[PDB]
Amino acid sequence: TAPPTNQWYHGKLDRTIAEERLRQAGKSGSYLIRESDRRPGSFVLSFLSQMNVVNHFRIIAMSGDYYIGGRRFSSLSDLIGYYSHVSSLLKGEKLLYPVAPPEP
Amino acid sequence: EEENIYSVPHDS
């Protein structure tokens, strides 16, 4: 289980706007996924931590799968599910609140 | 331009 793509995918988005969108949300645990403008075709999980620091994690898409760290997921839904319910993304912190783009 | 720095999850 994970929210639908329209609820958290922003397309190609630079880090500055990504952080602004998360700080407009303003809640620790807010997250989004974006295509990197600097490394096109690869993705980024952007996450607002309990310390009001946005953390950015690369997600590499290969063969219709997604890799973050050394971990393989078959869908972004499965990746979000894993870091929402199964494993901490940061020490003591999981994905909580999907942030949707102001435009779909 | 200098690239931004990315993090790795706690479990990796």
Author numbering:
A (entry chain A): 174 to 277
B (entry chain U): 1100 to 1111
Paper text:
p120RasGAP is a multidomain regulator of Ras signaling, containing two SH2 domains at its N-terminus and multiple other domains including a RasGAP. Binding of p190RhoGAP is mediated by phosphotyrosine-SH2 domain interactions, and a major driver is thought to be between the N-terminal SH2 of p120RasGAP and pTyr-1105 of p190RhoGAP. p190RhoGAP recruitment has multiple effects, including inhibition of Rho signaling by locating p190RhoGAP to the plasma membrane, and activation of Ras signaling by suppression of p120RasGAP’s RasGAP activity when it is bound to p190RhoGAP. The SH2 fold consists of a central β-sheet flanked by two α-helices, and both crystal structures reveal that the p120RasGAP N-terminal SH2 domain adopts this fold.
The co-crystals diffracted to 1.6 Å resolution and contain one dimer per asymmetric unit. Good electron density is observed for all residues of the peptide except Thr-1112. The co-crystal structure reveals a broadly canonical interaction between p120RasGAP N-terminal SH2 domain and the p190RhoGAP pTyr-1105 peptide. The interaction buries 1290 Å2 of total surface area and the peptide binds perpendicular to the central SH2 domain β-sheet, with pTyr-1105 at position 0 and Pro-1108 at position +3 inserted into the expected pockets. pTyr-1105 is coordinated by a salt-bridge to Arg-207, which is the conserved arginine of the FLVR motif, also commonly referred to as ArgβB5 in SH2 convention. It is also coordinated by Arg-188 (ArgαA2) and Ser-209 (SerβB7). The pocket is defined by residues Phe-230, Leu-262, Ile-241 and Tyr-256. In the co-crystal structure, the βE-βF loop is stabilized by peptide binding which allows a hydrogen-bond to form between the carbonyl oxygen of Leu-262 and the backbone nitrogen of His-1109.
